[PDB]
Every structure is written in structure tokens, then in C-alpha cells.
Design a protein around this ligand. Structure first.
Ligand SMILES: NCCCCCCN
Ligand code: NA
Length: 153
RNA sequence: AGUGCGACACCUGAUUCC
DNA sequence: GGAATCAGGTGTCGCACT
């Protein structure tokens, strides 16, 4: 039936050895089977699961704009990313980016970059279970892992 | 802030099986 | 590589008491 106005995308950020001596992080964006915009890229910068998860969503939005898409359904496993961008950020901006314990919000730069990207976009953030066997979740994850094998720069 | 709790991720190691 | 299982870790946030 119907057919809406949204285009669906699955993102994933992975980080092998997260919290260990040599973490390797990547981002993956999946637009559909064999879709030309699918990507698996090495994450530039500080290597962590949280940053990768947030930056995978940035990448999706960025690509979305590249195509004049402005009604996007973005699935991610990261409630940290969802809650951050759809809730915590409003408050952080009104309190000097401060944690529940008054400490500096660690991923400020990441959430700032993400919010800037959301401008002009009607994004519906949805959650997909990390262990979802759905093709979208697996491919995004597989893509992230492939990206993390790349070197930086 | 300290402590505790909650939550979603990301891992590392073993074992079974394909 | 993959279907699971068990141990243990960090990434990071909110919350409530002290
Ligand atoms: N439900 C308790 C989860 C604790 C996660 C600790 C991560 N450093
Ligand atoms: Na994920």
C-alpha cells in the first residue's frame, strides 16, 4: 500500500578493542542492498564506540543532504546517540555542556557536529537492536568493521 | 563531586557446533 | 567467516543520596 516520503538508512559505529590499548573504530552506513552509497570507513580521531556510533549517523545525514533528501528515517543501535541528539543536547546547551555530575560533557564536539548536520532535516531517529539479524543492521555493522581495517588520514 | 543505581552500545578471552 | 553460550572489561549518559 501507501508509500511515504521518507528514505530509510541504517548506521553503525564499531570499535574493536574499545577501552583497551589499541582501539580501531569504523562507521558504516547502509542504504539498501548493493546501494552505491553504502560505506565502511575508518573513524578519524579519538577511537571509541560512542564516537563511532555518533559519527556513523553524521555520515548518513551528510550523504542524505548530498542527495537533497530531507525526510530520513535513521536506525541506530545507539540510544546514547539518540537520547543525546533528541534530548540531552537541549539541556547541555542551556547549562554549559555539563554532565549530571557537573563534569564536562565528553562528546561535545561529536554532538555539536551532529546537531549542525540535523539542521534543515526532518529526521525520525529509530532504534534497532544491536543484535538484530535484520539485513540492515548486519550490513551496517559489517561495513563498519571493514572500514576499521583501513588506516587513518 | 563522591558513592550507588539504571540504560544502550562497543569489546577481550574461553567453550560447543557449522 | 558464521549459530550460540559463559567470564571479564570500557564508552558514556541520566538518576538519587551523601
Ligand atoms: N547495568 C550496568 C552497566 C554497567 C556498564 C559499565 C560500563 N563501564
Ligand atoms: Na552499534
Amino acid at each position: 500500500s501507501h508509500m511515504g516520503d521518507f528514505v530509510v538508512v541504517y548506521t553503525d559505529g564499531c570499535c574493536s578493542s574499545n577501552g583497551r590499548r589499541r582501539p580501531r573504530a569504523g562507521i558504516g552506513v547502509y542504504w539498501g542492498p548493493g546501494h552505491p552509497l553504502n560505506v565502511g570507513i575508518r573513524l578519524p580521531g579519538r577511537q571509541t564506540n560512542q564516537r563511532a556510533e555518533i559519527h556513523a549517523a553524521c555520515k548518513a545525514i551528510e550523504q542524505a543532504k548530498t542527495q537533497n533528501i530531507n525526510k530520513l528515517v535513521l536506525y541506530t543501535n545507539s540510544m546514547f546517540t539518540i537520547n543525546g541528539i533528541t534530548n540531552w543536547v537541549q539541556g547541555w546547551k542551556k547549562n554549559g555542556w555539563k554532565t549530571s555530575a557537573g563534569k564536562e560533557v565528553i562528546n561535545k564536539e561529536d554532538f555539536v557536529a551532529l546537531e549542525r548536520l540535523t539542521q534543515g532535516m526532518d529526521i525520525q531517529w529509530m532504534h534497532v537492536p544491536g543484535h538484530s539479524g535484520f539485513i540492515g543492521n548486519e550490513e551496517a555493522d559489517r561495513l563498519a568493521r571493514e572500514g576499521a581495517k583501513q588506516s587513518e588520514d
